[PDB]
Design a protein around this ligand. Sequence first.
Ligand SMILES: *[C@@H]1O[C@H](CO)[C@@H](O[C@@H]2O[C@H](CO)[C@@H](O[C@@H]3O[C@H](CO[C@H]4O[C@H](CO)[C@@H](O)[C@H](O)[C@@H]4O)[C@@H](O)[C@H](O[C@H]4O[C@H](CO)[C@@H](O)[C@H](O)[C@@H]4O)[C@@H]3O)[C@H](O)[C@H]2NC(C)=O)[C@H](O)[C@H]1NC(C)=O
Ligand SMILES: *[C@@H]1O[C@H](CO)[C@@H](O[C@@H]2O[C@H](CO)[C@@H](O[C@@H]3O[C@H](CO[C@H]4O[C@H](CO)[C@@H](O)[C@H](O)[C@@H]4O)[C@@H](O)[C@H](O[C@H]4O[C@H](CO)[C@@H](O)[C@H](O)[C@@H]4O)[C@@H]3O)[C@H](O)[C@H]2NC(C)=O)[C@H](O)[C@H]1NC(C)=O
Ligand SMILES: *[C@@H]1O[C@H](CO)[C@@H](O[C@@H]2O[C@H](CO)[C@@H](O[C@@H]3O[C@H](CO[C@H]4O[C@H](CO)[C@@H](O)[C@H](O)[C@@H]4O)[C@@H](O)[C@H](O[C@H]4O[C@H](CO)[C@@H](O)[C@H](O)[C@@H]4O)[C@@H]3O)[C@H](O)[C@H]2NC(C)=O)[C@H](O)[C@H]1NC(C)=O
Ligand SMILES: *[C@@H]1O[C@H](CO)[C@@H](O[C@@H]2O[C@H](CO)[C@@H](O[C@@H]3O[C@H](CO)[C@@H](O)[C@H](O)[C@@H]3O)[C@H](O)[C@H]2NC(C)=O)[C@H](O)[C@H]1NC(C)=O
Ligand SMILES: *[C@@H]1O[C@H](CO)[C@@H](O[C@@H]2O[C@H](CO)[C@@H](O[C@@H]3O[C@H](CO)[C@@H](O)[C@H](O)[C@@H]3O)[C@H](O)[C@H]2NC(C)=O)[C@H](O)[C@H]1NC(C)=O
Ligand SMILES: *[C@@H]1O[C@H](CO)[C@@H](O[C@@H]2O[C@H](CO)[C@@H](O[C@@H]3O[C@H](CO)[C@@H](O)[C@H](O)[C@@H]3O)[C@H](O)[C@H]2NC(C)=O)[C@H](O)[C@H]1NC(C)=O
Ligand SMILES: *[C@@H]1O[C@H](CO)[C@@H](O[C@@H]2O[C@H](CO)[C@@H](O)[C@H](O)[C@H]2NC(C)=O)[C@H](O)[C@H]1NC(C)=O
Ligand SMILES: *[C@@H]1O[C@H](CO)[C@@H](O[C@@H]2O[C@H](CO)[C@@H](O)[C@H](O)[C@H]2NC(C)=O)[C@H](O)[C@H]1NC(C)=O
Ligand SMILES: *[C@@H]1O[C@H](CO)[C@@H](O[C@@H]2O[C@H](CO)[C@@H](O)[C@H](O)[C@H]2NC(C)=O)[C@H](O)[C@H]1NC(C)=O
Ligand SMILES: CC(=O)N[C@H]1[C@H]([C@H](O)[C@H](O)CO)O[C@@](O)(C(=O)O)C[C@@H]1O
Ligand SMILES: CC(=O)N[C@H]1[C@H]([C@H](O)[C@H](O)CO)O[C@@](O)(C(=O)O)C[C@@H]1O
Ligand SMILES: CC(=O)N[C@H]1[C@H]([C@H](O)[C@H](O)CO)O[C@@](O)(C(=O)O)C[C@@H]1O
Ligand SMILES: *[C@@H]1O[C@H](CO)[C@@H](O)[C@H](O)[C@H]1NC(C)=O
Ligand SMILES: *[C@@H]1O[C@H](CO)[C@@H](O)[C@H](O)[C@H]1NC(C)=O
Ligand SMILES: *[C@@H]1O[C@H](CO)[C@@H](O)[C@H](O)[C@H]1NC(C)=O
Ligand SMILES: *[C@@H]1O[C@H](CO)[C@@H](O)[C@H](O)[C@H]1NC(C)=O
Ligand SMILES: *[C@@H]1O[C@H](CO)[C@@H](O)[C@H](O)[C@H]1NC(C)=O
Ligand SMILES: *[C@@H]1O[C@H](CO)[C@@H](O)[C@H](O)[C@H]1NC(C)=O
Ligand SMILES: *[C@@H]1O[C@H](CO)[C@@H](O)[C@H](O)[C@H]1NC(C)=O
Ligand SMILES: *[C@@H]1O[C@H](CO)[C@@H](O)[C@H](O)[C@H]1NC(C)=O
Ligand SMILES: *[C@@H]1O[C@H](CO)[C@@H](O)[C@H](O)[C@H]1NC(C)=O
Lengths: 317, 317, 317, 173, 173, 173
Amino acid sequence: PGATLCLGHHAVPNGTIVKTITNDQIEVTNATELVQSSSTGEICDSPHQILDGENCTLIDALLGDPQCDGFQNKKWDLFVERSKAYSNCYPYDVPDYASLRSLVASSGTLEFNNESFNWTGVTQNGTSSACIRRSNNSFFSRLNWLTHLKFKYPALNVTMPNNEKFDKLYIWGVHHPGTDNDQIFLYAQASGRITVSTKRSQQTVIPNIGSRPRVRNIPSRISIYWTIVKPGDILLINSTGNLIAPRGYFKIRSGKSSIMRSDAPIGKCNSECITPNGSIPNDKPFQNVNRITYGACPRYVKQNTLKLATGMRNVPE
Amino acid sequence: PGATLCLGHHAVPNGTIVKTITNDQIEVTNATELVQSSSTGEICDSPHQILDGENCTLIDALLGDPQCDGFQNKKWDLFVERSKAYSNCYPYDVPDYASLRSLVASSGTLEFNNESFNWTGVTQNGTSSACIRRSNNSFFSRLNWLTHLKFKYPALNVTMPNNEKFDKLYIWGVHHPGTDNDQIFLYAQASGRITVSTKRSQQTVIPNIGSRPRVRNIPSRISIYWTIVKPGDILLINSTGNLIAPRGYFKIRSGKSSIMRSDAPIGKCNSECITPNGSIPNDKPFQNVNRITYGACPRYVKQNTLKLATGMRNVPE
Amino acid sequence: PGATLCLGHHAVPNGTIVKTITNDQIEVTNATELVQSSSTGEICDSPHQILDGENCTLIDALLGDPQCDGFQNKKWDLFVERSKAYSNCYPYDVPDYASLRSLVASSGTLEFNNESFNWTGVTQNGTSSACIRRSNNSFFSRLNWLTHLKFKYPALNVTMPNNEKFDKLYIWGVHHPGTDNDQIFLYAQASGRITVSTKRSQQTVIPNIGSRPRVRNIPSRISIYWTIVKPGDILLINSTGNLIAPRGYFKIRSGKSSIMRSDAPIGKCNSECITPNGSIPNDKPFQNVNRITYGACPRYVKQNTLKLATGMRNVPE
Amino acid sequence: GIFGAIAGFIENGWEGMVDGWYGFRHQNSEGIGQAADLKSTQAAIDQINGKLNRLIGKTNEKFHQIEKEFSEVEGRIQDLEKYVEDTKIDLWSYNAELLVALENQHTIDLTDSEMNKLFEKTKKQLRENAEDMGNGCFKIYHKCDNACIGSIRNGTYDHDVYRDEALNNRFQI
Amino acid sequence: GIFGAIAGFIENGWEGMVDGWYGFRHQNSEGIGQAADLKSTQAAIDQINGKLNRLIGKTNEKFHQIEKEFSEVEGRIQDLEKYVEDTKIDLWSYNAELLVALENQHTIDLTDSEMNKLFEKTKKQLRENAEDMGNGCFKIYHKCDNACIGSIRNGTYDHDVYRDEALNNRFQI
Amino acid sequence: GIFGAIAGFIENGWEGMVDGWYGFRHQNSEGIGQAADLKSTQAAIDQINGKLNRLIGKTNEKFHQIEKEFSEVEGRIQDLEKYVEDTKIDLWSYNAELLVALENQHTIDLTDSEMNKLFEKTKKQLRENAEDMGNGCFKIYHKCDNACIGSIRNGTYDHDVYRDEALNNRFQI
Ligand SMILES: *[C@@H]1O[C@H](CO)[C@@H](O[C@@H]2O[C@H](CO)[C@@H](O[C@@H]3O[C@H](CO[C@H]4O[C@H](CO)[C@@H](O)[C@H](O)[C@@H]4O)[C@@H](O)[C@H](O[C@H]4O[C@H](CO)[C@@H](O)[C@H](O)[C@@H]4O)[C@@H]3O)[C@H](O)[C@H]2NC(C)=O)[C@H](O)[C@H]1NC(C)=O
Ligand SMILES: *[C@@H]1O[C@H](CO)[C@@H](O[C@@H]2O[C@H](CO)[C@@H](O[C@@H]3O[C@H](CO[C@H]4O[C@H](CO)[C@@H](O)[C@H](O)[C@@H]4O)[C@@H](O)[C@H](O[C@H]4O[C@H](CO)[C@@H](O)[C@H](O)[C@@H]4O)[C@@H]3O)[C@H](O)[C@H]2NC(C)=O)[C@H](O)[C@H]1NC(C)=O
Ligand SMILES: *[C@@H]1O[C@H](CO)[C@@H](O[C@@H]2O[C@H](CO)[C@@H](O[C@@H]3O[C@H](CO[C@H]4O[C@H](CO)[C@@H](O)[C@H](O)[C@@H]4O)[C@@H](O)[C@H](O[C@H]4O[C@H](CO)[C@@H](O)[C@H](O)[C@@H]4O)[C@@H]3O)[C@H](O)[C@H]2NC(C)=O)[C@H](O)[C@H]1NC(C)=O
Ligand SMILES: *[C@@H]1O[C@H](CO)[C@@H](O[C@@H]2O[C@H](CO)[C@@H](O[C@@H]3O[C@H](CO)[C@@H](O)[C@H](O)[C@@H]3O)[C@H](O)[C@H]2NC(C)=O)[C@H](O)[C@H]1NC(C)=O
Ligand SMILES: *[C@@H]1O[C@H](CO)[C@@H](O[C@@H]2O[C@H](CO)[C@@H](O[C@@H]3O[C@H](CO)[C@@H](O)[C@H](O)[C@@H]3O)[C@H](O)[C@H]2NC(C)=O)[C@H](O)[C@H]1NC(C)=O
Ligand SMILES: *[C@@H]1O[C@H](CO)[C@@H](O[C@@H]2O[C@H](CO)[C@@H](O[C@@H]3O[C@H](CO)[C@@H](O)[C@H](O)[C@@H]3O)[C@H](O)[C@H]2NC(C)=O)[C@H](O)[C@H]1NC(C)=O
Ligand SMILES: *[C@@H]1O[C@H](CO)[C@@H](O[C@@H]2O[C@H](CO)[C@@H](O)[C@H](O)[C@H]2NC(C)=O)[C@H](O)[C@H]1NC(C)=O
Ligand SMILES: *[C@@H]1O[C@H](CO)[C@@H](O[C@@H]2O[C@H](CO)[C@@H](O)[C@H](O)[C@H]2NC(C)=O)[C@H](O)[C@H]1NC(C)=O
Ligand SMILES: *[C@@H]1O[C@H](CO)[C@@H](O[C@@H]2O[C@H](CO)[C@@H](O)[C@H](O)[C@H]2NC(C)=O)[C@H](O)[C@H]1NC(C)=O
Ligand SMILES: CC(=O)N[C@H]1[C@H]([C@H](O)[C@H](O)CO)O[C@@](O)(C(=O)O)C[C@@H]1O
Ligand SMILES: CC(=O)N[C@H]1[C@H]([C@H](O)[C@H](O)CO)O[C@@](O)(C(=O)O)C[C@@H]1O
Ligand SMILES: CC(=O)N[C@H]1[C@H]([C@H](O)[C@H](O)CO)O[C@@](O)(C(=O)O)C[C@@H]1O
Ligand SMILES: *[C@@H]1O[C@H](CO)[C@@H](O)[C@H](O)[C@H]1NC(C)=O
Ligand SMILES: *[C@@H]1O[C@H](CO)[C@@H](O)[C@H](O)[C@H]1NC(C)=O
Ligand SMILES: *[C@@H]1O[C@H](CO)[C@@H](O)[C@H](O)[C@H]1NC(C)=O
Ligand SMILES: *[C@@H]1O[C@H](CO)[C@@H](O)[C@H](O)[C@H]1NC(C)=O
Ligand SMILES: *[C@@H]1O[C@H](CO)[C@@H](O)[C@H](O)[C@H]1NC(C)=O
Ligand SMILES: *[C@@H]1O[C@H](CO)[C@@H](O)[C@H](O)[C@H]1NC(C)=O
Ligand SMILES: *[C@@H]1O[C@H](CO)[C@@H](O)[C@H](O)[C@H]1NC(C)=O
Ligand SMILES: *[C@@H]1O[C@H](CO)[C@@H](O)[C@H](O)[C@H]1NC(C)=O
Ligand SMILES: *[C@@H]1O[C@H](CO)[C@@H](O)[C@H](O)[C@H]1NC(C)=O
């Protein structure tokens, strides 16, 4: 009689289809998904320091729009800019806006230090009805609108040395009045030319008088500029009018900070990977949620699923 | 006696050499080429909508050089720019030419809509002998050269609202005369300053009088600028001279359109992949014809041949 | 009795650990390193033509700072810029400095040809105490500081045709005086406007009078500009003051030249691959010395070691 | 599949083997039984866990990058930003596709290999006492009770004990 | 090559086999003949067609991109445009090179595997009635006419029919 | 490892084999000896040298590129320069990691394959004159002096010479 001894292997009733080099559909006993394709829809507040911009863009928080006073001196790993954000101060533009936004985002701080600029001969602290702070006429908190004093505006030649061990970021502006009347009323003379310089840089800007389409009933504009001043260098501001002066400097840091546009709510939860759609788990190597990411994230791919076999070929009875 | 039973495999007399991980030259029974290395030399007119620029660059067609009148309002998937193209109108330059060319190419349309600008107080429709259209002095078809009326040029402050549901692209210019005489003859006053604005942008340009080297006997120049106006925004043009005015706007679309430089003839044939050398078949995954491609194309690689084995090792008798 | 015949394989007492697809640590009999992780610390002078900048930046050598006279007309494959380099002439800036540096670096030559510009009506060869050459007041060797002649500075309208078969690179500047006094003393009239043009380009620059922070006791500045003139085109310079004129042109070539920042000493030795840390051997496919390389170099990777098995699994007794 | 056991000379798998991936079924004087082989099972699992250790929980931290969505038309710089990103994504997508295809081919092959190795080991162990029936089964030519089958599965089977009996049965007429 | 049949223990291929990739030659009482094996042939072809289906006719559509040739010197922005493209091309060129090398190694190995699998199947089928001569050939120790050879090629050979005859021939003096 | 010889049925390697990678040990009437097999050794070495020829001394020349370190903050253009480079480096780093993992898996497998092929060749050569003991060793059932062992290693062993002697020894009681 004797015996029979058979060698064999398992199988399952519910196998899964995977791709191989030689076949786009082969059934295996088990597989695991390598593409993260879902989010809960919330940006987790931990473990990255999240700063929700709410009604404020980063640049509005920087300049000091009256809706952004709560942001003073705050730091972030990720600044979250909302699509509903809007400006409610004097209408402005920033040539190279994208670059200023980027460099502030990357620095990760709105830390600001006031300095005592010598503005002898002009009226400081100009305000406007286009920039209401607690029902009073106001202006950007970090900027100083200088006007004539007793129908005189003498030439300004004002210095500020950097005797710190770090770089300083100065934000300043040029006022473009709507009319020649406005020019005279504010600065008591014809528009000139503003020159801001250091030992290693110079920027000159020409005020351009004229009507622009009204924004919150204002046909004039401010154009915003910036200057970095290195240790042992010196800021020099030379103006005969139209100067929206700095009140001090921002600290500029380096590190891991950034900015993201998202309307996702912030949640009390812990996740290392943030996308504009919300935080996502980061166990998987790939994801198809968003090309925009911050933190320890799976790599973005076009595939919505990639199944890795974790068992042998399934050969059912 | 018994029998002999031999197992074996085929071989061929004309095998082909391929590369492997362990050997740069091994003979197999058959292989297939994975790199497309040839074109017929013609750009197929199908299935992409091809627009042959002939003597016209895209920007000349946009502005309305008199050789480009046949291009009005045409659309394309691919605009083909020929190396023989040349301008035959008033000499101009476009600061950021590459960007204007790119954005129009990508939009894929020269659709133009005339608008009724209020130019009261000046002479419209200025022409030049440098821009002949049917033996008559002419000018760019989409631009309006404004000059004095009865030795007056009053300040222009002209508005055009966008009450459409789409964005408008405005093309305009500043005239730089060759001499102070020309300035007076044309605009009846010293050169000023042109400001074109919207609620969200402003551009000011200063005319600069002076001789440039003559081009088609003209020492003056026009500099071309553009402005996009979003729905519910408003174009404002403010000038006291030197304004080459828009006649209306171009529609700006998004989609799959582009531009290519090529001297290849256009053929009546059907091919999905276009290169500057002509259309190429797209069965293969790779190609070494040109890094410049449009359509469903193989990926450019440096190799001129990559042979994929499609049979076993060839072991001849 | 009979015999026993055993098949087997070697092993070694000193195996090495490698990574595989299924195991991060398996011992094999031998392996080879694929990542170059060391340099000797010297940049080999062969076989690439190396030009040590010593105290000079490329741009200082171009303009002709008095410490850089030894560099005239020299060529290079790789220009090496040292961190100790400093300028010792009239303080200047270059809008788009990075681009001028890049295009000269890539051209690989400082070959300069003097041309006879017609500067009738002005004083040539202006010098300064800020630019000492052999104890005498001097100036940049390739630039020509023009000032008034007998308190007159007539309008300049000066031409230079390119009747060569190659392109010409012109370097020129605008002088920004510290005060209105200086403006008058130098140019005998109010500051104007400089226009440099060809048939295909135009650049106009406005001198901006004012104090900048003093550099080597100088509060004025020169701003440097460049113009390429193609064969059969013509350079036109139009000025009423403040012009730092070219003395001729640089040849502009194309080829394999570049520039590198490094403080590594130059050695008498032969190596194809240069990094800022020194030359490195190029037998291996990868390296983790520096992302900055020049020549036939291994590819930069983040790994500091990648061991390729060159023997079987080691299975010791 | 490249070794020829799984989906090859083994006709099918066993849905009723739930305590291992590979193993043995037998018929003898005392009945029909099944037992998993732990060493082969663990060899396959270890290799697959090796792959997983190299793919799961290994992400890369990135912080400030470039913008990837744009509200306005700009031309050259934006064209370059978009192209850099599209280039990157296509390269990563290719890497992912290839990684999974290669790894899956290899998983199917390594699991086939472990089945073949267990079969070969068992064949050698049985020496002249059994014949391979071609379907992963051995005809054993001697009385082989439960302890004897157990000795085969545990590597303690002494072929010499049974060889005279087996040869007599195999080489009769 | 990794299995050891093609370019290994099989001395060479057969240029005269034109109706399949693998098969059988025999010599018996009725002559010398050749027949292709369709199942092994189709197994190899199917796998190779699987590779082709993943490489041929699968291109990617791209439209507006960046400029890649330049008529004027510009410096920084153009340096970046050129570097992005050169980077891309080198990465794709590497992918292509590696893809073809790996796929070709695998094709040579899978075709070798199919030869080995057919040999092993045939060996098992013959049981104690034949011996492996070491060169892909079996010496069959019984009269095996054309129908008998056919039964081997078709998987219908009953080894028990011939076993007494074969054992007597094999194990004589 | 996928073939099952090295680190499988061969218990361990031989530190005392220094003149080849694979070979033979024997015991017979005249003593115990060792000899390397040159053909299998050279087959493995050739394949590994093939890999090395494709990786070593094959670098790519690059000249003027983009800047990769920056002394000042600039914003958009510098963000793009840094991202292009970081992207490139991560892609190359991935390629390097994968290349080495795949190549090493393949080297271990191809060397295992060469051991298995030599074992199989030797098994077939011995015909009915030996039995496989399961550990890479054959019990040879006839007097096999040094010249006889040599004939096996050199492929000149005539199994028919010894077959009567061997069968008598194998199939006794
Ligand atoms: C099909 O194949 C897959 C892959 O091999 C198998 O999936 C694995 O299953 C095991 C057992 O359930 C899992 O082990 C458990 O992992 C938990 C971690 O979970 C998260 O984290 C990882 C990454 O960090 C993610 O990949 C994962 O999706 C989860 O988000 C541990 O917390 C578990 O701990 C439990 O058991 C241990 C035992 O010591 C105890 O310490 C605790 O008490 C605790 O309760 C556990 O280790 C493993 O994560 C799975 N891997 C993957 C990739 O999913 C399937 O089981 C298999 N299916 C079949 C039918 O065989
Ligand atoms: C060496 O190895 C290669 C690859 O395996 C073999 O090449 C294949 O050969 C077959 C048979 O000739 C080809 O099949 C035919 O394909 C045609 C499509 O041709 C074009 O399109 C593809 C991509 O879409 C391109 O790759 C290709 O280069 C062509 O540009 C079909 O139109 C054919 O149809 C004909 O037969 C069918 C049968 O049903 C009928 O419907 C029609 O009547 C028609 O006449 C056919 O299917 C296949 O394209 C080839 N592949 C490749 C990649 O080239 C070689 O045959 C082989 N050589 C040897 C000696 O074995
Ligand atoms: C572990 O595995 C590795 C890789 O297989 C083995 O390393 C090889 O060893 C051989 C023998 O020593 C080396 O061969 C020699 O190469 C020299 C070139 O050296 C440089 O150049 C290459 C690239 O161009 C670099 O990879 C290398 O690191 C060196 O920088 C030749 O000059 C040698 O020539 C000598 O012998 C020849 C014989 O004809 C004569 O012409 C001359 O007289 C001369 O003296 C020689 O060819 C080989 O370079 C090594 N490869 C690598 C990648 O390192 C180890 O040997 C092995 N270890 C063990 C214990 O087995
Ligand atoms: C140049 O032209 C523009 C557009 O025509 C002029 O701006 C417009 O000026 C008028 C008043 O002259 C503004 O009207 C005001 O509208 C608000 C809206 O509620 C209303 O509250 C006021 O009572 C008043 O009617 C109009 O808004 C404004 N339009 C735009 C688009 O800004 C501009 O004044 C002209 N410039 C010069 C110097 O003449
Ligand atoms: C500044 O200098 C430039 C160059 O010297 C002056 O331009 C030149 O002006 C002359 C006439 O004064 C042009 O001559 C004309 O040439 C054409 C060619 O066929 C001919 O048909 C005419 O009869 C006449 O001779 C010359 O072309 C022109 N050169 C260039 C390069 O443009 C320019 O006029 C000077 N500007 C001032 C304000 O003086
Ligand atoms: C605008 O303000 C700046 C800064 O206050 C003025 O520049 C400064 O001018 C003074 C002289 O008025 C310079 O003093 C000199 O310092 C050197 C240093 O050794 C010394 O050798 C001289 O004897 C003299 O004391 C000072 O360096 C300079 N400061 C800077 C930062 O440049 C500038 O003159 C003012 N402009 C106008 C038009 O008033
Ligand atoms: C994450 O958010 C993005 C938002 O852009 C989603 O992608 C968009 O999907 C819609 C369709 O639902 C498309 O019309 C858009 O064109 C997509 N935008 C882009 C930029 O690709 C994405 O689906 C979201 N993913 C998840 C998982 O929620
Ligand atoms: C397709 O067109 C390009 C045109 O640039 C060809 O590539 C050029 O080839 C010439 C030599 O024939 C070289 O001197 C140029 O440097 C190449 N240009 C570039 C940009 O690489 C290419 O050979 C053509 N290909 C085919 C198949 O016709
Ligand atoms: C080659 O030079 C670079 C100089 O940048 C070295 O990389 C730096 O290493 C230091 C630590 O020693 C870090 O603080 C820097 O952040 C690194 N810089 C960069 C840009 O990554 C590198 O170590 C040198 N390599 C060798 C082998 O000498
Ligand atoms: C500092 C100052 O006096 N600013 C005044 C402004 C400016 O004249 C214009 O906004 C500039 O164009 O106008 C007001 O009517 C306003 O906005 O409330 C009064 C305000 O006090
Ligand atoms: C609108 C107008 O009157 N343009 C006139 C121009 C301009 O004066 C110069 O081209 C500008 O520099 O000059 C002409 O000689 C010409 O070109 O035919 C006459 C022409 O009518
Ligand atoms: C050409 C010329 O006369 N340059 C003079 C300059 C300039 O006046 C200032 O440097 C410009 O601001 O000043 C000097 O004191 C100097 O630097 O030696 C005298 C020198 O001769
Ligand atoms: C099969 O079913 C079991 C039990 O329901 C489940 O845990 C397992 O994930 C399933 N496997 C597959 C491949 O679907
Ligand atoms: C700079 O300040 C000085 C001194 O007060 C003055 O002479 C000059 O006019 C100012 N310049 C400008 C451009 O405002
Ligand atoms: C071999 O020759 C045949 C018939 O001429 C041809 O169809 C086939 O493509 C050739 N194969 C190779 C590999 O060259
Ligand atoms: C703009 O138009 C207004 C009103 O006509 C006028 O006062 C002003 O001078 C114009 N501005 C310019 C820069 O032309
Ligand atoms: C082992 O030792 C030898 C002799 O010292 C040496 O040449 C060889 O490189 C070493 N191998 C490894 C893998 O360390
Ligand atoms: C250019 O030169 C001409 C002729 O000498 C003169 O009329 C004009 O003023 C100069 N222009 C400038 C901007 O200096
Ligand atoms: C075989 O091993 C198992 C351990 O799982 C043991 O229970 C059994 O008794 C063993 N049988 C024999 C016959 O060795
Ligand atoms: C084997 O199969 C073929 C079918 O191709 C058939 O014609 C032949 O008669 C069969 N022979 C035997 C002996 O089964
Ligand atoms: C086997 O080959 C070797 C060559 O290395 C030779 O010296 C030896 O005598 C040969 N022995 C026999 C028995 O063929």
